[PDB]
Structure formats: structure tokens, C-alpha cells
A = this chain, B = another copy of it.
């Protein structure tokens, strides 16, 4: 479905990378944060929903599902907050693979960037433009445009 996103939190070095995946397309947005708190997650969701039509978010863990600050942001931005339980078991594997791919790209750009946050945004760029042949960026626009029409 065009409005469904999944939250994904992965760790690298001693730092936290928060990722939102548009499920139907594989398109992502991502940020480096000092730690995964309710407040950080809330702010990330607010940014995402202002930029794409976020209808449903599958949260990455129970703490963010429970967080009153995350719930407030979801209320504010008109997002249905749901769990991220992989009722289809292949969901876990897809997310795992993406985290590996992302860390691999981060490794490939580390001669070019002084800070992790730059490397992560380089990885977002490369991931979203990668032709698999359409790109994830092409797919999300097509999916949403078709829905509007």
C-alpha cells in the first residue's frame, strides 16, 4: 500500500542510524542520532510525514510503539501507528539485508566523508538511485502518483 512505512534502527561504530523504508518501493530516508529515544523518533517521523504521504508506520520496537512522544507525533501528523511484528517472516530478512547493504555503502564512502552523518546520507542517495530496471525513487513516485490518480 502507498502510505505504508517501516521504521528500522541499526547501529554502526557506537552510533545509531534510524531508517524509514517505504515498504512497497524500498525507498528510504535515514538519520544519524545520538540514541534512539522517543523524542528523536518522534521528530524523525514528523520530518518524514511532512515530506511524503505517511499513512501507516510500523514501528521498529515496543519502546517506540509505547512512547507517548511518538504517539503525539503520529497523532499530530495523522499517522496510524502500528507494530512491526513480522507476521510474514520474510520481512525480517529484507530489513537485515538492507542494513547490511547500507553499512557496506557507508564503508565504500568512508574515504570521502569525515563524519558518519555525511556517509549515511551518501548511502541514502546511492540506495534510492540504484537500478534493480527502475530505482526505488522512481518506484515510490510511480506508486504514489498512481494512487492519487
- Assess whether A125 is in contact with B46, with CB atoms less than 8 Å apart: yes
Which residues of A (109-127) have their CB < 8 Å from a CB of B?
112, 117-118, 121-122, 124-125
- Chain A's interface size range is 20 to 34
Question: Does A51 reach chain B (CB closer than 8 Å)?
Answer: yes
Q: Closest chain B residue to A129 by CB distance?
A: B50
Contacts of A53 in B (CB 8 A): 137
CB distance from A124 to the nearest CB of B (A): 4
Question: Does A12 reach chain B (CB closer than 8 Å)?
Answer: no
- Report the separation of the CA atoms of residues A53 and B136 in the bound assembly, to the nearest whole angstrom: 12
* Interface SS of chain A: helix
Contacts of A85 in B (CB 8 A): none
Question: Does A35 reach chain B (CB closer than 8 Å)?
Answer: no
The 3 closest A-B pairs by CB, nearest first: A145-B145, A50-B125, A50-B124
| A and B contact pairs by CB, cutoff 8 A, 25 listed | A43-B117, A43-B121, A46-B118, A46-B121, A46-B122, A46-B125, A47-B121, A49-B125, A50-B122, A50-B125, A50-B129, A51-B124, A52-B137, A53-B137, A76-B112, A76-B122, A77-B125, A138-B148, A141-B145, A141-B148, A142-B145, A142-B148, A142-B149, A144-B145, A145-B146
